[PDB]
Scaffold this active site. Structure first.
Site, short mmCIF file in Angstrom:
data_model
loop_
_atom_site.label_atom_id
_atom_site.label_comp_id
_atom_site.label_asym_id
_atom_site.label_seq_id
_atom_site.Cartn_x
_atom_site.Cartn_y
_atom_site.Cartn_z
N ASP A 1 0.82 -1.20 0.00
CA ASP A 1 0.00 0.00 0.00
C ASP A 1 0.86 1.26 0.00
OD1 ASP A 1 -1.89 1.99 0.36
OD2 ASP A 1 -2.56 1.32 2.33
N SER B 1 -0.31 15.67 -11.94
CA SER B 1 -0.56 15.30 -13.32
C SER B 1 -0.77 16.56 -14.16
CB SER B 1 -1.77 14.38 -13.43
OG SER B 1 -2.11 14.15 -14.79
#
Ligand SMILES: O[C@H]1[C@H](NCc2ccncc2)[C@H]2CO[C@H](O2)[C@@H]1N1CCOCC1
EC number: 3.4.23.22
Length: 330
Positions: A35, A199
């Site tokens: 994770d 992004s």
């Protein structure tokens, strides 16, 4: 040193991925959920409330000759889906695909929430976010990667998650045969303890690319792709009959629909998520309504590049003094 382990989807929908981990002496092998959005290594154990264990493999520290109770240490964690777990702490030897760390904090669950109990294929989590997020009190503990970093050939690990297929976590090296083209690296903020990056934008299907900064985290421990409401609306608008359902808890679409791809930007580079990656199947058994794999981050408070996005790429988690993230197509 290096390590390399195969990671496997837990079901036909790629709801999560498990990776075998050796703990203790002799080894007890548990299948853990790696994770990159959390920083505790915790396991089902001999100490877990019996009614809360249903099929999981447990860690039994009393049978490990290298297990040592960490005096006075406890842990308690809650995740974004309302799930939780808690218990005490041992230090023990932990190995992943040939890479060994001695004296790793292994957090032994006394309690787990129902969602963990119900998931028989996941024996615990191995956190790979930054150690600042570790919940062990009164003395915070380091992640497996943090503990291994100095011994690694290079202070990196890579995630290569498969779509309906096996994949790989590598530690300490970059497998240049695992991707096509180049790896584009992008800046990381560790201010929230995550692999947080920005992004450069997105496209829906064959649509024009929209340049817009989207701040989010690279999180192997989240199944879906969580993005701003504006973006998610633009995506599902391209799917006939799709709509957001409060009862179901997000966007659903007719199972017969053809899903468009979704492209996200990494600098000037582009990662294309194929449309069928976004299909998470009938909302209930036998239904012709299917759940969408791109959902709004409005409720969560942060954008999450979860497995739906990450499994479309070869992803480098670069833990150099100034950490960065690398993405390549594959
Ligand atoms: O994807 C989930 C994760 N469980 C995946 C899962 C594992 C195993 N089976 C099914 C699902 C955990 C860790 O972070 C959250 O909760 C994450 N979402 C964040 C935002 O949306 C709500 C939840």
């Amino acid at each position: 040193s290096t390590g390399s382990a195969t990671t496997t989807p837990i079901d036909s929908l790629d709801d999560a991925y498990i990776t075998p981990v050796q703990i203790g002496t002799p080894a007890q092998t548990l299948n853990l959920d790696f994770d990159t959005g959390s920083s505790d290594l915790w396991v089902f154990s001999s100490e877990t409330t019996a009614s809360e264990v249903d099929g999981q493999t447990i860690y039994t520290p009393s049978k490990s000759t290298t297990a040592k109770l960490l005096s006075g240490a406890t842990w308690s964690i809650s995740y974004g889906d309302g799930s939780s777990s808690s218990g005490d702490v041992y230090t023990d030897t932990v190995s992943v695909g040939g890479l060994t760390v001695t004296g790793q904090a292994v957090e032994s669950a006394k309690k787990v929430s129902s969602s963990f109990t119900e998931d028989s294929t996941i024996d615990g989590l191995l956190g790979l976010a930054f150690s600042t997020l570790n919940t062990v009190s009164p003395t915070q503990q380091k992640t497996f990667f943090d503990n291994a970093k100095a011994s690694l050939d290079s202070p990196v690990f890579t995630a290569d998650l498969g779509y309906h297929a096996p994949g790989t976590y590598n530690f300490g090296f970059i497998d240049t045969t695992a991707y096509t083209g180049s790896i584009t690296y992008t800046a990381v903020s560790t201010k929230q303890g995550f692999w947080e990056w920005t992004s450069t934008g997105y496209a829906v299907g064959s649509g024009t690319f929209k340049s817009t900064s989207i701040d989010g985290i690279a999180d192997t421990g989240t199944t879906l792709l969580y993005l701003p409401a504006t973006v998610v609306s633009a995506y599902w608008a391209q799917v006939s009959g799709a709509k957001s359902s409060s009862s179901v808890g997000g966007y659903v679409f007719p199972c017969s629909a053809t899903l468009p791809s979704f492209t996200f930007g990494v600098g000037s580079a582009r990662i294309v998520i194929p449309g069928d990656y976004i299909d998470f199947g009938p909302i209930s058994t036998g239904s012709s309504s299917c759940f969408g794999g791109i959902q709004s981050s409005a409720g969560i408070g942060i954008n999450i590049f979860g497995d739906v996005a990450l499994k479309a790429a070869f992803v480098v988690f670069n833990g150099a003094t100034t950490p960065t993230l690398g993405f390549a197509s594959k």
